[PDB]
Each structure stands twice: as C-alpha cells, then as structure tokens.
Design an enzyme around this catalytic site. Structure first.
Site, PDB file in Angstrom:
ATOM      1  N   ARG A  38       5.802   9.541   0.247  1.00 11.52           N
ATOM      2  CA  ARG A  38       4.620   8.743  -0.056  1.00 11.52           C
ATOM      3  C   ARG A  38       3.347   9.564   0.008  1.00 11.52           C
ATOM      4  NH1 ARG A  38       1.632   4.142   3.181  1.00 11.52           N
ATOM      5  NH2 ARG A  38       0.737   2.848   1.544  1.00 11.52           N
ATOM      6  N   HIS A  42       0.495   9.841  -2.938  1.00 11.61           N
ATOM      7  CA  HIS A  42      -0.930   9.539  -2.747  1.00 11.61           C
ATOM      8  C   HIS A  42      -1.826  10.752  -2.972  1.00 11.61           C
ATOM      9  CE1 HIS A  42      -0.826   5.455  -0.406  1.00 11.61           C
ATOM     10  NE2 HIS A  42      -0.168   5.419  -1.551  1.00 11.61           N
ATOM     11  N   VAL A  46      -4.691  11.075  -6.880  1.00 14.76           N
ATOM     12  CA  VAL A  46      -6.126  11.216  -6.613  1.00 14.76           C
ATOM     13  C   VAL A  46      -6.507  12.667  -6.841  1.00 14.76           C
ATOM     14  CG1 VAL A  46      -8.023  10.760  -4.968  1.00 14.76           C
ATOM     15  CG2 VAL A  46      -5.907   9.394  -4.841  1.00 14.76           C
ATOM     16  N   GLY A  48      -5.138  14.628  -8.717  1.00 17.27           N
ATOM     17  CA  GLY A  48      -3.964  15.478  -8.868  1.00 17.27           C
ATOM     18  C   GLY A  48      -3.390  15.961  -7.556  1.00 17.27           C
ATOM     19  N   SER A  52      -5.704  17.124  -1.439  1.00 18.06           N
ATOM     20  CA  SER A  52      -6.985  16.535  -1.061  1.00 18.06           C
ATOM     21  C   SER A  52      -6.760  15.480   0.011  1.00 18.06           C
ATOM     22  CB  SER A  52      -7.688  15.912  -2.274  1.00 18.06           C
ATOM     23  OG  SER A  52      -6.982  14.788  -2.765  1.00 18.06           O
ATOM     24  N   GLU A  64      -9.743  10.799   2.629  1.00 21.76           N
ATOM     25  CA  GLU A  64      -8.985   9.807   1.879  1.00 21.76           C
ATOM     26  C   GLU A  64      -8.133   9.005   2.855  1.00 21.76           C
ATOM     27  OE1 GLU A  64      -6.743  11.668  -1.306  1.00 21.76           O
ATOM     28  OE2 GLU A  64      -8.465  12.962  -1.742  1.00 21.76           O
ATOM     29  N   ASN A  70      -4.338   4.157   2.386  1.00 21.72           N
ATOM     30  CA  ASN A  70      -3.941   5.089   3.437  1.00 21.72           C
ATOM     31  C   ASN A  70      -4.202   4.672   4.881  1.00 21.72           C
ATOM     32  OD1 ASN A  70      -2.919   7.184   1.733  1.00 21.72           O
ATOM     33  ND2 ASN A  70      -5.034   7.709   1.204  1.00 21.72           N
ATOM     34  N   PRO A 139      -2.492   2.275  -6.671  1.00 20.52           N
ATOM     35  CA  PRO A 139      -2.105   0.914  -7.047  1.00 20.52           C
ATOM     36  C   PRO A 139      -1.860   0.084  -5.795  1.00 20.52           C
ATOM     37  CG  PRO A 139      -0.197   2.289  -7.115  1.00 20.52           C
ATOM     38  CD  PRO A 139      -1.390   3.224  -6.924  1.00 20.52           C
ATOM     39  N   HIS A 170      10.982   3.231  -3.390  1.00 22.30           N
ATOM     40  CA  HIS A 170      11.075   2.119  -2.456  1.00 22.30           C
ATOM     41  C   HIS A 170      12.542   1.844  -2.145  1.00 22.30           C
ATOM     42  CE1 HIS A 170       6.826   0.505  -3.549  1.00 22.30           C
ATOM     43  NE2 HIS A 170       6.721   1.553  -2.793  1.00 22.30           N
ATOM     44  N   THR A 171      13.395   2.844  -2.394  1.00 21.20           N
ATOM     45  CA  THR A 171      14.813   2.704  -2.075  1.00 21.20           C
ATOM     46  C   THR A 171      14.947   2.951  -0.566  1.00 21.20           C
ATOM     47  OG1 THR A 171      17.083   3.399  -2.622  1.00 21.20           O
ATOM     48  CG2 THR A 171      15.414   5.143  -2.448  1.00 21.20           C
ATOM     49  N   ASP A 222      14.216  -1.672   1.064  1.00 20.64           N
ATOM     50  CA  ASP A 222      15.543  -1.885   0.473  1.00 20.64           C
ATOM     51  C   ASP A 222      16.447  -2.577   1.489  1.00 20.64           C
ATOM     52  OD1 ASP A 222      18.081  -1.799  -0.623  1.00 20.64           O
ATOM     53  OD2 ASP A 222      18.118   0.387  -0.921  1.00 20.64           O
ATOM     54  N   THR A 225      20.302  -0.504   1.522  1.00 26.16           N
ATOM     55  CA  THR A 225      20.368   0.734   2.304  1.00 26.16           C
ATOM     56  C   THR A 225      18.953   1.203   2.667  1.00 26.16           C
ATOM     57  OG1 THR A 225      20.658   1.930   0.191  1.00 26.16           O
ATOM     58  CG2 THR A 225      22.632   1.565   1.536  1.00 26.16           C
TER      59      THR A 225
HETATM   60  C1  HEM Z   1       4.117   1.387  -8.285  1.00 28.75           C
HETATM   61  C2  HEM Z   1       3.108   1.161  -7.293  1.00 28.75           C
HETATM   62  C3  HEM Z   1       3.237   1.263  -5.905  1.00 28.75           C
HETATM   63  C4  HEM Z   1       2.766   0.323  -5.034  1.00 28.75           C
HETATM   64  C5  HEM Z   1       1.804  -0.830  -5.337  1.00 28.75           C
HETATM   65  C6  HEM Z   1       3.275   0.653  -3.743  1.00 28.75           C
HETATM   66  C7  HEM Z   1       3.138  -0.149  -2.572  1.00 28.75           C
HETATM   67  C8  HEM Z   1       3.558   0.245  -1.249  1.00 28.75           C
HETATM   68  C9  HEM Z   1       3.176  -0.427   0.009  1.00 28.75           C
HETATM   69  C10 HEM Z   1       2.180  -1.585   0.135  1.00 28.75           C
HETATM   70  C11 HEM Z   1       3.727   0.282   1.022  1.00 28.75           C
HETATM   71  C12 HEM Z   1       3.732  -0.173   2.453  1.00 28.75           C
HETATM   72  C13 HEM Z   1       2.700   0.557   3.256  1.00 28.75           C
HETATM   73  C14 HEM Z   1       2.501  -0.019   4.653  1.00 28.75           C
HETATM   74  O1  HEM Z   1       3.076  -1.079   4.967  1.00 28.75           O
HETATM   75  O2  HEM Z   1       1.752   0.596   5.437  1.00 28.75           O
HETATM   76  C15 HEM Z   1       4.374   1.442   0.408  1.00 28.75           C
HETATM   77  C16 HEM Z   1       5.272   2.284   1.083  1.00 28.75           C
HETATM   78  C17 HEM Z   1       6.030   3.304   0.525  1.00 28.75           C
HETATM   79  N1  HEM Z   1       5.916   3.722  -0.804  1.00 28.75           N
HETATM   80 FE1  HEM Z   1       5.084   2.703  -2.308  1.00 28.75          FE
HETATM   81  N2  HEM Z   1       3.963   1.880  -3.786  1.00 28.75           N
HETATM   82  C18 HEM Z   1       3.915   2.263  -5.112  1.00 28.75           C
HETATM   83  C19 HEM Z   1       4.575   3.403  -5.615  1.00 28.75           C
HETATM   84  C20 HEM Z   1       5.293   4.333  -4.864  1.00 28.75           C
HETATM   85  C21 HEM Z   1       5.677   5.665  -5.358  1.00 28.75           C
HETATM   86  C22 HEM Z   1       5.307   6.205  -6.731  1.00 28.75           C
HETATM   87  C23 HEM Z   1       6.276   6.335  -4.330  1.00 28.75           C
HETATM   88  C24 HEM Z   1       6.962   7.564  -4.318  1.00 28.75           C
HETATM   89  C25 HEM Z   1       7.574   8.152  -5.474  1.00 28.75           C
HETATM   90  C26 HEM Z   1       6.155   5.449  -3.199  1.00 28.75           C
HETATM   91  C27 HEM Z   1       6.722   5.727  -1.949  1.00 28.75           C
HETATM   92  C28 HEM Z   1       6.702   4.862  -0.867  1.00 28.75           C
HETATM   93  C29 HEM Z   1       7.455   5.030   0.358  1.00 28.75           C
HETATM   94  C30 HEM Z   1       8.529   6.094   0.547  1.00 28.75           C
HETATM   95  C31 HEM Z   1       7.030   4.084   1.241  1.00 28.75           C
HETATM   96  C32 HEM Z   1       7.391   3.905   2.698  1.00 28.75           C
HETATM   97  C33 HEM Z   1       6.552   4.842   3.530  1.00 28.75           C
HETATM   98  C34 HEM Z   1       6.863   4.763   5.014  1.00 28.75           C
HETATM   99  O3  HEM Z   1       7.760   3.986   5.407  1.00 28.75           O
HETATM  100  O4  HEM Z   1       6.202   5.489   5.781  1.00 28.75           O
HETATM  101  N3  HEM Z   1       5.536   4.239  -3.535  1.00 28.75           N
HETATM  102  N4  HEM Z   1       4.219   1.437  -0.966  1.00 28.75           N
HETATM  103  C1  LIG Z   2      -1.603  -0.087   1.291  1.00 32.20           C
HETATM  104  O1  LIG Z   2      -2.301  -0.367   0.081  1.00 32.20           O
HETATM  105  C2  LIG Z   2      -3.321  -1.298   0.062  1.00 32.20           C
HETATM  106  C3  LIG Z   2      -3.795  -2.061   1.138  1.00 32.20           C
HETATM  107  C4  LIG Z   2      -4.857  -2.986   0.973  1.00 32.20           C
HETATM  108  C5  LIG Z   2      -5.391  -3.787   2.066  1.00 32.20           C
HETATM  109  C6  LIG Z   2      -6.343  -4.725   2.055  1.00 32.20           C
HETATM  110  C7  LIG Z   2      -6.778  -5.439   3.259  1.00 32.20           C
HETATM  111  O2  LIG Z   2      -6.270  -5.192   4.389  1.00 32.20           O
HETATM  112  O3  LIG Z   2      -7.696  -6.336   3.106  1.00 32.20           O
HETATM  113  C8  LIG Z   2      -5.423  -3.114  -0.303  1.00 32.20           C
HETATM  114  C9  LIG Z   2      -4.961  -2.366  -1.357  1.00 32.20           C
HETATM  115  C10 LIG Z   2      -3.909  -1.448  -1.204  1.00 32.20           C
HETATM  116  O4  LIG Z   2      -3.482  -0.718  -2.271  1.00 32.20           O
HETATM  117 CA   LIG Z   3      -5.037  14.663  -4.343  1.00 26.17          CA
HETATM  118 CA   LIG Z   4      18.375   2.652  -0.394  1.00 26.82          CA
END
Ligand code: HEM
Ligand SMILES: COc1cc(/C=C/C(=O)O)ccc1O
Ligand SMILES: [Ca+2]
Ligand SMILES: [Ca+2]
Length: 306
Positions: A38, A42, A46, A48, A52, A64, A70, A139, A170-171, A222, A225
């Site tokens: 992740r 991120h 931003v 590239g 950063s 950031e 973040n 996003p 998100h697997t 997921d 798994t």
């Molecule tokens: C398509 C748009 C995407 C959205 C809106 C999104 C949304 C989210 C959210 C809200 C979380 C939870 C963060 C938290 O609860 O603190 C998260 C976690 C995560 N995302 Fe996504 N994500 C996106 C794309 C991706 C991409 C492109 C990757 C990697 C190729 C990614 C990798 C991950 C991973 C691995 C986690 C878990 C991180 C952890 O457990 O520390 N995400 N994402």
């Molecule tokens: C982890 O990603 C995000 C978190 C928030 C949180 C908003 C709030 O707490 O009001 C908004 C947009 C995001 O893309």
């Molecule tokens: Ca960057």
């Molecule tokens: Ca999995």
C-alpha cells in the site's frame, strides 16, 4: 528508461536484503507485507513513485503522512527505514528510497504467495512532499466506479485492467470499520444497507462493526484468505462480498460493463490475475519517475539530503 538490471552491478544484493527484512518483520507483524504494498501505491499516485510519501514534516512543506488517505492509516515506515539502513550499509549511497520501496512492494507480494518478477529500477527521490496532491489524488473507498476510473486516469493509468488488477491488492490486508459503516447501516442516505453487499456477509460485518462501535477496529479485506496473495478477492466480488464500496463497484456498478468481464477473468484463473497484476504493477511503477540526475539518492528516506 527504467530497467530491472539497474543495480545488478552496483548493489547485486539489494533485493535479498529487502526480502530478509520483510521475512523477519512478518514473524511479529503478519500485516506488514500488505502495508508495504500500500505504501508503494500511495507513493506512485502522488507525483509518481518518488518516495515523496516517506518524507516527514518540515517548516516549508507538510508531510503526505497527514493526508486523509494516510493519516492513522498508512504504516510500516520504520520497516522501510530498517531495510534502507541495511542497504546503505551494503552499498553506500546507491539505492534510492523510491526504488527501495518498489522492490519492497514486489517482495511483499511474492512473500505473501503472489507472483515473482523483477521490477524496473532507476527511480530517484523527490526533494519535497505533496500533501494537497495526496488529498486530491488518492481514491476513496466511497468513490463510485466513475470516480475510481477518473482517479486512475488522472495519474496516468487509463486501462480498466489497471484498476481491476491493482484492486486485487485487497486480496490481503486490513480495513477499519470506519470505512464501511455507511454500507452496513445507512448507505448514501437511504437509511438502508448497501444492496450490493451480500445479506449473509452483511450480518457478519455488522457483528464486527456494530453501530456506535470502535470505528478503528480492523476487518480483513478478503474473507477467504486474509493474508494470502491470491485471486480469491475476485471470487468474493462475484458473490457480492467485496468489503468496501470501491471493491464491489468493479462488479456491481451500472458503469461496470467493462470491469465485470475482467473480474470474472481474474476470478477464474490465478495465472490470468497474476499476469495482469504484474503488468499493472509495472505500469503504476512507471508513473512520472525522476531519473538520471533528477532528484537524489536519499540517505535517510525521511529527509532530503543535507
Ligand atoms: C482502487 C482504489 C482503492 C481504494 C479506494 C482503496 C481503499 C482502501 C482502504 C480504505 C484501506 C483501509 C485503510 C485503513 O483502514 O486504514 C485500504 C487498504 C489497503 N489497500 Fe487499498 N484502495 C485502493 C487501491 C489499492 C491498490 C492499488 C493497492 C495496491 C496495489 C492497495 C493496497 C491496499 C492494501 C494492501 C491494504 C491493506 C493495508 C494494511 O493492512 O496495512 N489498495 N485501501
Ligand atoms: C483512507 O482513505 C480515506 C479516508 C478518509 C477519511 C475521512 C474522515 O475520517 O472523515 C477520506 C478519504 C480517504 O480516501
Ligand atoms: Ca510520490
Ligand atoms: Ca487472499
């Protein structure tokens, strides 16, 4: 042009040092592989993949790390510092933080059971951080499919395959109850749960995230798994079991004519998913890199040199 052999002569063991660091960390923190992937995502969305995101606050620019995507969310920064220190010991002033994080993401994916490949290298480190750009570019889980597409296109990923395949990250990993409360109890001010969420899974999620409960509680992305990098994320979507709104829209949105077949293709074949994930990963990794003499080789990923 970025190239996979960039450090084959200057720091042949960079990949191995990175791998060993993650393996050791995984023993005490099984979530770190997901966290590192992740971080790279991120970083790349931003300005590239320029590390950063690793910069801390200074009086002239904000970090950031305080962006909505973040803050109280991104993690693993000290682990990046550990492998950076080890790499700097093995090969002084050679590997950029940007490239180091790219390698960490790839090794993290492989260690979790995902594909194995050599990432293009040669990226250099930014001389500033971009908080505002991070807030505008990352996003959100509540985005509609059109907004997710707009988000990827904005940073340079035009293909629906980029969105569907990279969403496979998100697997594994965790998500806070905070981000699905609306889907569980009041989606889009309807006073009802999101109808695209499987009713049986809805009950399960509601038990993990009760109304007025701990919004910071964590849930697995997921349900099949939780910690294994595989294609089960897509099988879930086909059953209306995507965790966050942005996951399920890939399959249920009225604008998903182009994403539905991709979800099915990845749910049907591990090989197909893995190939598309590597492809999409390298494309994301190729977003506006600083190369040659542009930027620097940061010695401490948290601050610009001297
Ligand atoms: C398509 C748009 C995407 C959205 C809106 C999104 C949304 C989210 C959210 C809200 C979380 C939870 C963060 C938290 O609860 O603190 C998260 C976690 C995560 N995302 Fe996504 N994500 C996106 C794309 C991706 C991409 C492109 C990757 C990697 C190729 C990614 C990798 C991950 C991973 C691995 C986690 C878990 C991180 C952890 O457990 O520390 N995400 N994402
Ligand atoms: C982890 O990603 C995000 C978190 C928030 C949180 C908003 C709030 O707490 O009001 C908004 C947009 C995001 O893309
Ligand atoms: Ca960057
Ligand atoms: Ca999995």
């Amino acid at each position: 042009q970025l190239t996979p052999t960039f450090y084959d002569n200057s720091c042949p063991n960079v990949s191995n040092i990175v791998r060993d660091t993650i393996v050791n960390e995984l023993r005490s923190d099984p979530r770190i592989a997901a966290s590192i992937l992740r971080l790279h995502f991120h970083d790349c969305f931003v300005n590239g993949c320029d590390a950063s995101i690793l910069l801390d606050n200074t009086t002239s620019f904000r970090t950031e790390k305080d962006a909505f995507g973040n803050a109280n969310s991104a993690r693993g920064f000290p682990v990046i510092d550990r492998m950076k220190a080890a790499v700097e010991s093995a090969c002084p002033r050679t590997v950029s933080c940007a490239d180091l994080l790219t390698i960490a993401a790839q090794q993290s994916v492989t260690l979790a059971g995902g594909p194995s490949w050599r990432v293009p290298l040669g990226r250099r480190d930014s001389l500033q951080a971009f908080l505002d750009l991070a807030n505008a570019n990352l996003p959100a889980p509540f985005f509609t499919l059109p907004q997710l597409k707009d988000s990827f296109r904005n940073v340079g990923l035009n293909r629906s395959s980029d969105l569907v395949a990279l969403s496979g990250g998100h697997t594994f990993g965790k998500n806070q109850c905070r981000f699905i409360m609306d889907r569980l109890y009041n989606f889009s001010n309807t006073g009802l749960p999101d109808p695209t969420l499987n009713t049986t899974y809805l009950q399960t999620l509601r038990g993990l995230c009760p109304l007025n409960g701990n919004l910071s509680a964590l849930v697995d992305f997921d349900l099949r798994t939780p910690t294994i990098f595989d294609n089960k994320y897509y099988v879930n979507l086909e059953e209306q079991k995507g965790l966050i709104q942005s996951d399920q829209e890939l399959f249920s949105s009225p604008n998903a004519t182009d994403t539905i077949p991709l979800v099915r293709s990845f749910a049907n074949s591990t090989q197909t998913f893995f190939n598309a994930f590597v492809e999409a990963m390298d494309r994301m990794g190729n977003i506006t890199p600083l190369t040659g003499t542009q930027g620097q080789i940061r010695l401490n990923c948290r601050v610009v040199n001297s």
